[PDB]
Amino acid sequence: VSLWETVQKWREYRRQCQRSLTEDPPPTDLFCNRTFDEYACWPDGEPGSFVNVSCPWYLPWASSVPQGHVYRFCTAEGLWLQKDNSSLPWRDLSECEE
Amino acid sequence: XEGXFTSDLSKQMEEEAVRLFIEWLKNGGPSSGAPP
């Protein structure tokens, strides 16, 4: 365990997300927008479906949750599901917990 | 913190720092402008 090592792996994960965000081809006209939320990298979402991404590989316990995914939901309006009083969209990260 | 001064202390402490860093990330910390 090392805080510097985890921060560097997080910087690397962020960098790989920024590569995808800029380089992946555009999607239909309606989709939830790809984004990095500081915890996980999200692709463009299909309206009306859950969106899965693997637990982020910089987590120190990533190897204890090798099959874990984290989830968002992309509404039929093409907006990530989000409560009015939350500054972050809805996310289920229970499969990535220590 | 009784019984805390162990050889394991310095590592137990880095481990909590990494845990807090991850919690901060889950809160959007690096880019958040929210009041403290």
UniProtKB/Swiss-Prot annotation, chain A:
Effect of residue 58 to A: Abolishes stimulation of cAMP accumulation in response to GLP-1
Extracellular side: 1-98
Entry superkingdom: Eukaryota
Site (Interaction with the endogenous ligand GLP-1): 91, 98
Positions annotated with a glycan in the UniProt record: 33, 52, 85
Posttranslational mods: N-glycosylation enhances cell surface expression and lengthens receptor half-life by preventing degradation in the ER.
Disulfide bridge partners, by residue number: 17-41, 32-74, 55-96
Result, substituting residue 3 to A: No effect on stimulation of cAMP accumulation and on GLP-1 binding
Location of the protein in the cell: Cell membrane
Outcome, altering residue 98 to Q: No effect on stimulation of cAMP accumulation in response to GLP-1
Effect of residue 91 to A: Strongly decreased stimulation of cAMP accumulation in response to GLP-1
Result, substituting residue 59 to A: Abolishes stimulation of cAMP accumulation in response to GLP-1
Subunit structure: May form homodimers and heterodimers with GIPR.
Function description: G-protein coupled receptor for glucagon-like peptide 1 (GLP-1). Ligand binding triggers activation of a signaling cascade that leads to the activation of adenylyl cyclase and increased intracellular cAMP levels. Plays a role in regulating insulin secretion in response to GLP-1.
Membership in a protein family: Belongs to the G-protein coupled receptor 2 family.
Note: Selective recognition of glucagon-like peptide over glucagon is determined by residues located at the C-terminal end of the glucagon-like peptide.
Protein name: Glucagon-like peptide 1 receptor
Full-protein residues shown: 30 to 128 of 463
Swiss-Prot record, chain B:
Compartments where located: Secreted
Known tissue expression: Expressed by the venom gland.
Coiled-coil ranges from the UniProt annotation: none
Family: Belongs to the glucagon family.
Record function comment: Venom protein that mimics the incretin hormone glucagon-like peptide 1 (GLP-1). It stimulates insulin synthesis and secretion, protects against beta-cell apoptosis in response to different insults, and promotes beta-cell proliferation. It also promotes satiety, reduces food intake, reduces fat deposition, reduces body weight and inhibits gastric emptying. Interacts with GLP-1 receptor (GLP1R). Induces hypotension that is mediated by relaxation of cardiac smooth muscle.
Listed name of the protein: Exendin-4
Lineage summary: Eukaryota, Metazoa, Chordata, Craniata, Vertebrata
